[PDB]
PDB file of C-alpha atoms and ligand atoms in Angstrom:
ATOM      1  CA  UNK A 150      22.041 -20.697 -97.235  1.00  0.00           C
ATOM      2  CA  UNK A 151      24.831 -20.895 -99.807  1.00  0.00           C
ATOM      3  CA  UNK A 152      24.595 -17.129-100.205  1.00  0.00           C
ATOM      4  CA  UNK A 153      25.099 -16.959 -96.439  1.00  0.00           C
ATOM      5  CA  UNK A 154      28.094 -18.353 -94.538  1.00  0.00           C
ATOM      6  CA  UNK A 155      27.655 -18.162 -90.753  1.00  0.00           C
ATOM      7  CA  UNK A 156      29.787 -18.829 -87.681  1.00  0.00           C
ATOM      8  CA  UNK A 157      29.271 -18.435 -83.934  1.00  0.00           C
ATOM      9  CA  UNK A 158      32.129 -17.556 -81.597  1.00  0.00           C
ATOM     10  CA  UNK A 159      32.162 -17.875 -77.815  1.00  0.00           C
ATOM     11  CA  UNK A 160      33.282 -14.776 -75.888  1.00  0.00           C
ATOM     12  CA  UNK A 161      34.399 -15.317 -72.279  1.00  0.00           C
ATOM     13  CA  UNK A 162      33.386 -12.810 -69.615  1.00  0.00           C
ATOM     14  CA  UNK A 163      35.211  -9.495 -69.981  1.00  0.00           C
ATOM     15  CA  UNK A 164      37.560 -10.928 -72.616  1.00  0.00           C
ATOM     16  CA  UNK A 165      38.739  -8.877 -75.607  1.00  0.00           C
ATOM     17  CA  UNK A 166      39.206  -9.762 -79.279  1.00  0.00           C
ATOM     18  CA  UNK A 167      41.680  -7.546 -81.149  1.00  0.00           C
ATOM     19  CA  UNK A 168      41.947  -7.239 -84.928  1.00  0.00           C
ATOM     20  CA  UNK A 169      44.740  -5.441 -86.767  1.00  0.00           C
ATOM     21  CA  UNK A 170      44.891  -5.052 -90.529  1.00  0.00           C
ATOM     22  CA  UNK A 171      42.015  -7.483 -90.947  1.00  0.00           C
ATOM     23  CA  UNK A 172      41.051  -7.645 -94.637  1.00  0.00           C
ATOM     24  CA  UNK A 173      37.350  -8.222 -95.308  1.00  0.00           C
ATOM     25  CA  UNK A 174      37.139 -10.748 -98.184  1.00  0.00           C
ATOM     26  CA  UNK A 175      33.368 -10.366 -98.496  1.00  0.00           C
ATOM     27  CA  UNK A 176      30.626  -8.312 -96.865  1.00  0.00           C
ATOM     28  CA  UNK A 177      30.119  -9.376 -93.268  1.00  0.00           C
ATOM     29  CA  UNK A 178      27.852  -8.543 -90.347  1.00  0.00           C
ATOM     30  CA  UNK A 179      28.066  -9.568 -86.713  1.00  0.00           C
ATOM     31  CA  UNK A 180      26.358  -9.012 -83.391  1.00  0.00           C
ATOM     32  CA  UNK A 181      26.268 -10.377 -79.853  1.00  0.00           C
ATOM     33  CA  UNK A 182      23.465 -12.703 -78.768  1.00  0.00           C
ATOM     34  CA  UNK A 183      23.239 -11.203 -75.286  1.00  0.00           C
ATOM     35  CA  UNK A 184      24.978  -9.010 -72.737  1.00  0.00           C
ATOM     36  CA  UNK A 185      26.883  -5.866 -73.645  1.00  0.00           C
ATOM     37  CA  UNK A 186      30.210  -5.310 -75.416  1.00  0.00           C
ATOM     38  CA  UNK A 187      32.518  -2.391 -76.158  1.00  0.00           C
ATOM     39  CA  UNK A 188      33.729  -1.890 -79.713  1.00  0.00           C
ATOM     40  CA  UNK A 189      36.775   0.328 -80.182  1.00  0.00           C
ATOM     41  CA  UNK A 190      37.368   1.473 -83.753  1.00  0.00           C
ATOM     42  CA  UNK A 191      41.052   2.309 -84.161  1.00  0.00           C
ATOM     43  CA  UNK A 192      40.421   3.604 -87.689  1.00  0.00           C
ATOM     44  CA  UNK A 193      38.010   6.355 -86.652  1.00  0.00           C
ATOM     45  CA  UNK A 194      39.358   6.572 -83.102  1.00  0.00           C
ATOM     46  CA  UNK A 195      35.944   5.979 -81.529  1.00  0.00           C
ATOM     47  CA  UNK A 196      34.378   3.569 -79.042  1.00  0.00           C
ATOM     48  CA  UNK A 197      30.834   2.575 -78.149  1.00  0.00           C
ATOM     49  CA  UNK A 198      28.712  -0.048 -76.438  1.00  0.00           C
ATOM     50  CA  UNK A 199      26.670  -2.594 -78.361  1.00  0.00           C
ATOM     51  CA  UNK A 200      23.793  -4.836 -77.305  1.00  0.00           C
ATOM     52  CA  UNK A 201      22.010  -7.909 -78.666  1.00  0.00           C
ATOM     53  CA  UNK A 202      20.206  -5.608 -81.114  1.00  0.00           C
ATOM     54  CA  UNK A 203      23.242  -3.789 -82.470  1.00  0.00           C
ATOM     55  CA  UNK A 204      24.353  -5.022 -85.875  1.00  0.00           C
ATOM     56  CA  UNK A 205      27.850  -4.216 -87.144  1.00  0.00           C
ATOM     57  CA  UNK A 206      28.490  -4.254 -90.883  1.00  0.00           C
ATOM     58  CA  UNK A 207      31.954  -4.670 -92.417  1.00  0.00           C
ATOM     59  CA  UNK A 208      32.502  -3.439 -95.979  1.00  0.00           C
ATOM     60  CA  UNK A 209      34.141  -5.790 -98.464  1.00  0.00           C
ATOM     61  CA  UNK A 210      37.756  -4.922 -99.344  1.00  0.00           C
ATOM     62  CA  UNK A 211      38.058  -2.818 -96.198  1.00  0.00           C
ATOM     63  CA  UNK A 212      41.021  -3.168 -93.810  1.00  0.00           C
ATOM     64  CA  UNK A 213      39.762  -3.203 -90.223  1.00  0.00           C
ATOM     65  CA  UNK A 214      41.516  -2.179 -87.002  1.00  0.00           C
ATOM     66  CA  UNK A 215      39.281  -2.640 -83.945  1.00  0.00           C
ATOM     67  CA  UNK A 216      38.651  -4.531 -80.734  1.00  0.00           C
ATOM     68  CA  UNK A 217      35.570  -5.978 -79.057  1.00  0.00           C
ATOM     69  CA  UNK A 218      35.511  -6.266 -75.273  1.00  0.00           C
ATOM     70  CA  UNK A 219      32.869  -8.143 -73.327  1.00  0.00           C
ATOM     71  CA  UNK A 220      31.239  -6.089 -70.581  1.00  0.00           C
ATOM     72  CA  UNK A 221      29.163  -9.023 -69.324  1.00  0.00           C
ATOM     73  CA  UNK A 222      29.777 -11.399 -66.421  1.00  0.00           C
ATOM     74  CA  UNK A 223      28.458 -14.297 -68.513  1.00  0.00           C
ATOM     75  CA  UNK A 224      29.567 -15.906 -71.769  1.00  0.00           C
ATOM     76  CA  UNK A 225      28.495 -14.164 -74.971  1.00  0.00           C
ATOM     77  CA  UNK A 226      27.999 -15.647 -78.427  1.00  0.00           C
ATOM     78  CA  UNK A 227      29.061 -13.541 -81.387  1.00  0.00           C
ATOM     79  CA  UNK A 228      27.294 -14.467 -84.613  1.00  0.00           C
ATOM     80  CA  UNK A 229      29.069 -13.698 -87.877  1.00  0.00           C
ATOM     81  CA  UNK A 230      27.332 -13.762 -91.252  1.00  0.00           C
ATOM     82  CA  UNK A 231      29.330 -13.731 -94.462  1.00  0.00           C
ATOM     83  CA  UNK A 232      27.403 -12.799 -97.613  1.00  0.00           C
ATOM     84  CA  UNK A 233      28.347 -14.190-101.036  1.00  0.00           C
ATOM     85  CA  UNK A 234      29.001 -11.802-103.914  1.00  0.00           C
ATOM     86  CA  UNK A 235      26.275 -13.538-105.929  1.00  0.00           C
ATOM     87  CA  UNK A 236      23.724 -12.562-103.294  1.00  0.00           C
ATOM     88  CA  UNK A 237      25.148  -9.063-102.864  1.00  0.00           C
ATOM     89  CA  UNK A 238      24.765  -8.347-106.581  1.00  0.00           C
ATOM     90  CA  UNK A 239      21.179  -9.624-106.320  1.00  0.00           C
ATOM     91  CA  UNK A 240      20.760  -6.914-103.693  1.00  0.00           C
ATOM     92  CA  UNK A 241      22.326  -4.339-106.011  1.00  0.00           C
ATOM     93  CA  UNK A 242      19.495  -5.258-108.368  1.00  0.00           C
ATOM     94  CA  UNK A 243      16.625  -4.639-105.949  1.00  0.00           C
ATOM     95  CA  UNK A 244      18.134  -1.252-105.190  1.00  0.00           C
ATOM     96  CA  UNK A 245      17.284   1.139-108.035  1.00  0.00           C
ATOM     97  CA  UNK A 246      18.166   4.821-108.296  1.00  0.00           C
ATOM     98  CA  UNK A 247      34.228   5.876 -97.249  1.00  0.00           C
ATOM     99  CA  UNK A 248      32.950   4.491 -93.939  1.00  0.00           C
ATOM    100  CA  UNK A 249      34.026   0.836 -93.653  1.00  0.00           C
ATOM    101  CA  UNK A 250      32.469  -0.083 -90.314  1.00  0.00           C
ATOM    102  CA  UNK A 251      28.743   0.612 -90.010  1.00  0.00           C
ATOM    103  CA  UNK A 252      26.808   0.192 -86.764  1.00  0.00           C
ATOM    104  CA  UNK A 253      23.035  -0.221 -86.793  1.00  0.00           C
ATOM    105  CA  UNK A 254      20.757  -0.278 -83.751  1.00  0.00           C
ATOM    106  CA  UNK A 255      17.981  -2.682 -84.794  1.00  0.00           C
ATOM    107  CA  UNK A 256      14.249  -2.503 -84.084  1.00  0.00           C
ATOM    108  CA  UNK A 257      14.017  -6.177 -83.084  1.00  0.00           C
ATOM    109  CA  UNK A 258      12.600  -6.963 -86.534  1.00  0.00           C
ATOM    110  CA  UNK A 259      15.780  -6.863 -88.547  1.00  0.00           C
ATOM    111  CA  UNK A 260      17.783  -8.431 -85.719  1.00  0.00           C
ATOM    112  CA  UNK A 261      15.063 -11.091 -85.725  1.00  0.00           C
ATOM    113  CA  UNK A 262      15.672 -11.962 -89.374  1.00  0.00           C
ATOM    114  CA  UNK A 263      19.448 -11.807 -88.972  1.00  0.00           C
ATOM    115  CA  UNK A 264      19.205 -14.130 -85.970  1.00  0.00           C
ATOM    116  CA  UNK A 265      17.342 -16.622 -88.151  1.00  0.00           C
ATOM    117  CA  UNK A 266      20.094 -16.471 -90.774  1.00  0.00           C
ATOM    118  CA  UNK A 267      22.763 -17.482 -88.262  1.00  0.00           C
ATOM    119  CA  UNK A 268      20.222 -19.953 -86.909  1.00  0.00           C
ATOM    120  CA  UNK A 269      20.497 -21.726 -90.252  1.00  0.00           C
ATOM    121  CA  UNK A 270      16.847 -21.092 -91.180  1.00  0.00           C
ATOM    122  CA  UNK A 271      15.537 -23.951 -89.016  1.00  0.00           C
ATOM    123  CA  UNK A 272      12.648 -22.112 -87.363  1.00  0.00           C
ATOM    124  CA  UNK A 273      11.679 -19.943 -90.332  1.00  0.00           C
ATOM    125  CA  UNK A 274      12.534 -20.506 -93.993  1.00  0.00           C
ATOM    126  CA  UNK A 275      12.480 -17.069 -95.620  1.00  0.00           C
ATOM    127  CA  UNK A 276      12.319 -16.957 -99.414  1.00  0.00           C
ATOM    128  CA  UNK A 277      14.917 -15.605-101.830  1.00  0.00           C
ATOM    129  CA  UNK A 278      12.552 -12.727-102.583  1.00  0.00           C
ATOM    130  CA  UNK A 279      12.107 -11.699 -98.943  1.00  0.00           C
ATOM    131  CA  UNK A 280      15.794 -12.072 -98.086  1.00  0.00           C
ATOM    132  CA  UNK A 281      16.726  -9.979-101.126  1.00  0.00           C
ATOM    133  CA  UNK A 282      14.296  -7.146-100.369  1.00  0.00           C
ATOM    134  CA  UNK A 283      15.171  -7.342 -96.671  1.00  0.00           C
ATOM    135  CA  UNK A 284      18.954  -7.102 -96.951  1.00  0.00           C
ATOM    136  CA  UNK A 285      18.757  -4.655 -99.849  1.00  0.00           C
ATOM    137  CA  UNK A 286      16.439  -2.551 -97.713  1.00  0.00           C
ATOM    138  CA  UNK A 287      18.820  -2.966 -94.783  1.00  0.00           C
ATOM    139  CA  UNK A 288      21.938  -1.645 -96.523  1.00  0.00           C
ATOM    140  CA  UNK A 289      19.880   1.045 -98.249  1.00  0.00           C
ATOM    141  CA  UNK A 290      19.035   2.397 -94.799  1.00  0.00           C
ATOM    142  CA  UNK A 291      22.429   2.102 -93.127  1.00  0.00           C
ATOM    143  CA  UNK A 292      23.964   3.789 -96.183  1.00  0.00           C
ATOM    144  CA  UNK A 293      21.978   6.875 -95.221  1.00  0.00           C
ATOM    145  CA  UNK A 294      23.074   6.629 -91.590  1.00  0.00           C
ATOM    146  CA  UNK A 295      26.644   7.028 -92.882  1.00  0.00           C
ATOM    147  CA  UNK A 296      28.995   8.705 -95.383  1.00  0.00           C
ATOM    148  CA  UNK A 297      28.718   6.830 -98.688  1.00  0.00           C
ATOM    149  CA  UNK A 298      27.394   3.732-100.426  1.00  0.00           C
ATOM    150  CA  UNK A 299      28.122   0.495 -98.578  1.00  0.00           C
ATOM    151  CA  UNK A 300      27.949  -1.451-101.842  1.00  0.00           C
ATOM    152  CA  UNK A 301      30.368  -0.752-104.716  1.00  0.00           C
ATOM    153  CA  UNK A 302      30.460  -0.351-108.411  1.00  0.00           C
ATOM    154  CA  UNK A 303      32.063  -3.557-108.973  1.00  0.00           C
ATOM    155  CA  UNK A 304      34.939  -2.220-110.930  1.00  0.00           C
ATOM    156  CA  UNK A 305      36.320  -0.338-108.015  1.00  0.00           C
ATOM    157  CA  UNK A 306      40.132  -0.173-108.034  1.00  0.00           C
ATOM    158  CA  UNK A 307      40.454  -1.968-104.687  1.00  0.00           C
ATOM    159  CA  UNK A 308      38.109  -4.725-105.914  1.00  0.00           C
ATOM    160  CA  UNK A 309      40.306  -5.208-108.986  1.00  0.00           C
ATOM    161  CA  UNK A 310      43.461  -5.425-106.875  1.00  0.00           C
ATOM    162  CA  UNK A 311      41.897  -7.843-104.374  1.00  0.00           C
ATOM    163  CA  UNK A 312      40.382 -10.152-106.995  1.00  0.00           C
ATOM    164  CA  UNK A 313      43.741 -10.193-108.758  1.00  0.00           C
ATOM    165  CA  UNK A 314      45.562 -11.325-105.616  1.00  0.00           C
ATOM    166  CA  UNK A 315      42.894 -13.864-104.649  1.00  0.00           C
ATOM    167  CA  UNK A 316      43.034 -15.347-108.158  1.00  0.00           C
ATOM    168  CA  UNK A 317      46.701 -16.290-107.666  1.00  0.00           C
ATOM    169  CA  UNK A 318      47.377 -16.149-103.916  1.00  0.00           C
ATOM    170  CA  UNK A 319      50.841 -17.722-104.070  1.00  0.00           C
ATOM    171  CA  UNK A 320      52.260 -15.376-106.678  1.00  0.00           C
ATOM    172  CA  UNK A 321      55.114 -13.264-105.260  1.00  0.00           C
ATOM    173  CA  UNK A 322      53.065 -10.078-105.633  1.00  0.00           C
ATOM    174  CA  UNK A 323      54.806  -6.768-106.220  1.00  0.00           C
ATOM    175  CA  UNK A 324      53.499  -3.356-107.131  1.00  0.00           C
ATOM    176  CA  UNK A 325      54.853  -3.978-110.657  1.00  0.00           C
ATOM    177  CA  UNK A 326      52.582  -7.010-110.973  1.00  0.00           C
ATOM    178  CA  UNK A 327      49.529  -5.032-109.940  1.00  0.00           C
ATOM    179  CA  UNK A 328      50.239  -2.171-112.345  1.00  0.00           C
ATOM    180  CA  UNK A 329      50.977  -4.543-115.205  1.00  0.00           C
ATOM    181  CA  UNK A 330      47.878  -6.667-114.657  1.00  0.00           C
ATOM    182  CA  UNK A 331      45.581  -3.663-114.241  1.00  0.00           C
ATOM    183  CA  UNK A 332      47.265  -1.589-116.960  1.00  0.00           C
ATOM    184  CA  UNK A 333      47.320   1.326-114.519  1.00  0.00           C
ATOM    185  CA  UNK A 334      50.152   3.332-112.974  1.00  0.00           C
ATOM    186  CA  UNK A 335      51.006   3.294-109.287  1.00  0.00           C
ATOM    187  CA  UNK A 336      50.380   7.007-108.806  1.00  0.00           C
ATOM    188  CA  UNK A 337      46.736   6.312-109.547  1.00  0.00           C
ATOM    189  CA  UNK A 338      46.416   2.998-107.672  1.00  0.00           C
ATOM    190  CA  UNK A 339      48.360   3.959-104.541  1.00  0.00           C
ATOM    191  CA  UNK A 340      45.322   5.793-103.159  1.00  0.00           C
ATOM    192  CA  UNK A 341      43.614   2.458-102.485  1.00  0.00           C
ATOM    193  CA  UNK A 342      46.332   1.448-100.022  1.00  0.00           C
ATOM    194  CA  UNK A 343      46.908   4.905 -98.554  1.00  0.00           C
ATOM    195  CA  UNK A 344      43.244   5.470 -97.697  1.00  0.00           C
ATOM    196  CA  UNK A 345      43.385   2.085 -95.953  1.00  0.00           C
ATOM    197  CA  UNK A 346      46.601   2.920 -94.153  1.00  0.00           C
ATOM    198  CA  UNK A 347      48.620  -0.048 -95.413  1.00  0.00           C
ATOM    199  CA  UNK A 348      51.856  -0.568 -97.311  1.00  0.00           C
ATOM    200  CA  UNK A 349      52.014  -3.142-100.097  1.00  0.00           C
ATOM    201  CA  UNK A 350      53.429  -5.928 -97.899  1.00  0.00           C
ATOM    202  CA  UNK A 351      50.656  -5.442 -95.328  1.00  0.00           C
ATOM    203  CA  UNK A 352      47.950  -5.492 -97.966  1.00  0.00           C
ATOM    204  CA  UNK A 353      49.063  -8.777 -99.498  1.00  0.00           C
ATOM    205  CA  UNK A 354      49.570 -10.360 -96.073  1.00  0.00           C
ATOM    206  CA  UNK A 355      46.088  -9.224 -94.999  1.00  0.00           C
ATOM    207  CA  UNK A 356      44.469 -10.824 -98.053  1.00  0.00           C
ATOM    208  CA  UNK A 357      46.419 -14.041 -97.491  1.00  0.00           C
ATOM    209  CA  UNK A 358      45.319 -14.247 -93.847  1.00  0.00           C
ATOM    210  CA  UNK A 359      41.647 -13.906 -94.749  1.00  0.00           C
ATOM    211  CA  UNK A 360      42.272 -16.533 -97.423  1.00  0.00           C
ATOM    212  CA  UNK A 361      43.646 -18.853 -94.723  1.00  0.00           C
ATOM    213  CA  UNK A 362      40.503 -18.267 -92.643  1.00  0.00           C
ATOM    214  CA  UNK A 363      38.295 -19.195 -95.611  1.00  0.00           C
ATOM    215  CA  UNK A 364      40.326 -22.393 -95.984  1.00  0.00           C
ATOM    216  CA  UNK A 365      39.930 -23.280 -92.324  1.00  0.00           C
ATOM    217  CA  UNK A 366      36.171 -22.851 -92.719  1.00  0.00           C
ATOM    218  CA  UNK A 367      35.963 -25.423 -95.536  1.00  0.00           C
ATOM    219  CA  UNK A 368      37.183 -28.144 -93.205  1.00  0.00           C
ATOM    220  CA  UNK A 369      40.955 -27.887 -93.468  1.00  0.00           C
ATOM    221  CA  UNK A 370      42.771 -28.428 -90.177  1.00  0.00           C
ATOM    222  CA  UNK A 371      46.349 -29.055 -91.297  1.00  0.00           C
ATOM    223  CA  UNK A 372      47.914 -25.758 -90.248  1.00  0.00           C
ATOM    224  CA  UNK A 373      51.162 -26.547 -92.064  1.00  0.00           C
ATOM    225  CA  UNK A 374      49.321 -27.047 -95.336  1.00  0.00           C
ATOM    226  CA  UNK A 375      47.169 -23.950 -94.834  1.00  0.00           C
ATOM    227  CA  UNK A 376      50.267 -21.772 -94.508  1.00  0.00           C
ATOM    228  CA  UNK A 377      51.553 -22.658 -97.987  1.00  0.00           C
ATOM    229  CA  UNK A 378      48.120 -22.975 -99.553  1.00  0.00           C
ATOM    230  CA  UNK A 379      47.564 -19.356 -98.523  1.00  0.00           C
ATOM    231  CA  UNK A 380      50.693 -18.062-100.273  1.00  0.00           C
ATOM    232  CA  UNK A 381      53.014 -17.739 -97.300  1.00  0.00           C
ATOM    233  CA  UNK A 382      56.710 -18.532 -97.732  1.00  0.00           C
ATOM    234  CA  UNK A 383      56.861 -20.383 -94.414  1.00  0.00           C
ATOM    235  CA  UNK A 384      54.710 -21.689 -91.551  1.00  0.00           C
ATOM    236  CA  UNK A 385      56.392 -19.363 -89.041  1.00  0.00           C
ATOM    237  CA  UNK A 386      55.729 -16.219 -91.040  1.00  0.00           C
ATOM    238  CA  UNK A 387      52.122 -17.328 -91.550  1.00  0.00           C
ATOM    239  CA  UNK A 388      51.672 -17.853 -87.817  1.00  0.00           C
ATOM    240  CA  UNK A 389      53.355 -14.560 -86.950  1.00  0.00           C
ATOM    241  CA  UNK A 390      51.192 -12.598 -89.373  1.00  0.00           C
ATOM    242  CA  UNK A 391      48.048 -14.500 -88.322  1.00  0.00           C
ATOM    243  CA  UNK A 392      48.689 -13.788 -84.624  1.00  0.00           C
ATOM    244  CA  UNK A 393      49.382 -10.132 -85.409  1.00  0.00           C
ATOM    245  CA  UNK A 394      46.099  -9.907 -87.326  1.00  0.00           C
ATOM    246  CA  UNK A 395      43.716 -12.032 -85.218  1.00  0.00           C
ATOM    247  CA  UNK A 396      45.540 -11.747 -81.887  1.00  0.00           C
ATOM    248  CA  UNK A 397      45.289 -15.551 -81.614  1.00  0.00           C
ATOM    249  CA  UNK A 398      47.272 -18.451 -83.112  1.00  0.00           C
ATOM    250  CA  UNK A 399      46.027 -20.173 -86.295  1.00  0.00           C
ATOM    251  CA  UNK A 400      45.372 -23.448 -84.462  1.00  0.00           C
ATOM    252  CA  UNK A 401      43.537 -21.509 -81.751  1.00  0.00           C
ATOM    253  CA  UNK A 402      41.173 -19.921 -84.278  1.00  0.00           C
ATOM    254  CA  UNK A 403      40.611 -23.279 -85.994  1.00  0.00           C
ATOM    255  CA  UNK A 404      39.552 -24.687 -82.619  1.00  0.00           C
ATOM    256  CA  UNK A 405      37.045 -21.856 -82.274  1.00  0.00           C
ATOM    257  CA  UNK A 406      35.487 -23.096 -85.514  1.00  0.00           C
ATOM    258  CA  UNK A 407      34.125 -26.002 -83.475  1.00  0.00           C
ATOM    259  CA  UNK A 408      31.378 -24.345 -81.452  1.00  0.00           C
ATOM    260  CA  UNK A 409      30.056 -25.459 -78.077  1.00  0.00           C
TER     261      UNK A 409
HETATM  262  C1  PAM B 155      39.868 -14.034 -82.535  1.00  0.00           C
HETATM  263  C2  PAM B 155      38.767 -15.021 -82.904  1.00  0.00           C
HETATM  264  C3  PAM B 155      37.761 -14.382 -83.846  1.00  0.00           C
HETATM  265  C4  PAM B 155      36.494 -13.998 -83.094  1.00  0.00           C
HETATM  266  C5  PAM B 155      35.490 -13.351 -84.030  1.00  0.00           C
HETATM  267  C6  PAM B 155      34.300 -12.781 -83.261  1.00  0.00           C
HETATM  268  C7  PAM B 155      34.554 -11.330 -82.814  1.00  0.00           C
HETATM  269  C8  PAM B 155      34.145 -10.286 -83.520  1.00  0.00           C
HETATM  270  C9  PAM B 155      33.384 -10.426 -84.845  1.00  0.00           C
HETATM  271  C10 PAM B 155      34.157  -9.776 -85.983  1.00  0.00           C
HETATM  272  C11 PAM B 155      34.159 -10.665 -87.224  1.00  0.00           C
HETATM  273  C12 PAM B 155      35.498 -10.591 -87.952  1.00  0.00           C
HETATM  274  C13 PAM B 155      36.342 -11.830 -87.669  1.00  0.00           C
HETATM  275  C14 PAM B 155      36.656 -12.584 -88.952  1.00  0.00           C
HETATM  276  C15 PAM B 155      36.487 -14.095 -88.752  1.00  0.00           C
HETATM  277  C16 PAM B 155      35.366 -14.611 -89.638  1.00  0.00           C
HETATM  278  O1  PAM B 155      35.320 -14.319 -90.849  1.00  0.00           O
HETATM  279  O2  PAM B 155      34.471 -15.347 -89.168  1.00  0.00           O
END
């Protein structure tokens, strides 16, 4: 359970959630509990319908640009599972021998286990062993259904940059700071941002927004405090960037962390 952080979001009939420059702090996976939805991937310029068996995987350190639109006349619950790095590396272990958004059409076996994870393991209490072989076997499969490895040699350049920023979120980050800390020139590091279609400012802001989300999940409701705790120079800039990224206001998202 501590290796799994889950949330459930309500989706009104035919409503749309829009994400722009959304930085994925840790591996995530989500799916709808019922009905049908339309996912539009602005990064690959593609769209497709998903059902209660479709599982979407988001790669850590990726910068997402997509929208999800309900195509159901009833409310839909979107379950989101966040996996800890400690568990992910456990998965790397059970697996021996550039796509950031992976879609997997389940065989109501995997979506059954995933549904129990969001369900807080209160109907079935899988073991560490099973969960490790399951998930490891899950990514191992989806990796084949796509371009490259979903997991990453930990010392990836983007991972180094992200961890750096997260380790001192309020520092007034500049390219010079990144190059100096990583002992690497910008000509070599710039590919990480280019391939993700973001300029330096956007990258730092994206990491700070996801950091603010993590804070709101711990039980922090004071928006004013969250703005500064997340490294933003002001509450207004935080709110502007948050709204631009999540398409909703910070306080609005916090409210969604309640659940009905
Ligand atoms: C705008 C409110 C957020 C609604 C989130 C549910 C919709 C799609 C699932 C995508 C998950 C990425 C959102 C990040 C938030 C989180 O980490 O829980």
